[PDB]
Structure 1
Amino acid sequence: AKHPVPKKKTSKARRDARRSHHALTPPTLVPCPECKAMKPPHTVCPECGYYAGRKVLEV
């Protein structure tokens, strides 16, 4: 409701052209050593836990 304001409705081709980078990237995961589940690396596997400092395992 004030100073600078869009001159011309941005066309469909141009709106969609700026969303050419709006794409999401899939989460990056790896097989879990013990259980066969998938886990984002460097995270404590919820199911199994680390060798040493406690898993706090679902057990």
Structure 2
Amino acid sequence: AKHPVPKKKTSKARRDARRSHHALTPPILVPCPECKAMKPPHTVCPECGYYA
């Protein structure tokens, strides 16, 4: 409310424009040796385990 405020409603085209890099990059995964299952890199995950 106080001092600074928008001088103009943001044109949809400019709103949807500012969104540009909103999208989220899907998680990085790789198969693991133990199981045929998916894991993130450098992470110990269920249905498997490790070695020492």
> Could you tell me the TM-score, scaled by structure 1's length?
0.81
Superposition map of 1:43-54 within 5 A: 43-52=43-52
- SS of residue matched to 1:14: helix
- SS of residue matched to 2:20: helix
Superposition map of 1:27-42 within 5 A: 27-42=27-42
Q: Does 1:6 align with 2:6?
A: yes
Q: Which residue of 2 aligns with 1:56?
A: none
Q: Distance in 2 between matches of 1:43 and 1:34?
A: 13
CA contact (8 A) 1:30 1:39 kept: yes
Q: In the TM superposition, what whole-angstrom CA distance separates every residue of 1:3-57 from its partner, at most 9, and x where no partner exists?
A: 10000101011001110010110100000111111000100022211111xxxxx
CA contact (8 A) 1:31 1:37 kept: yes
Percent identity (aligned): 98
User: Relative contact order, CA 8 A, sep 6+: which one is greater?
Assistant: 2
Following TM superposition, the consecutive aligned residue runs of length 4 or more in structure 1 with deviations greater than 4 angstroms are none
Gaps of 5+ in 2: none
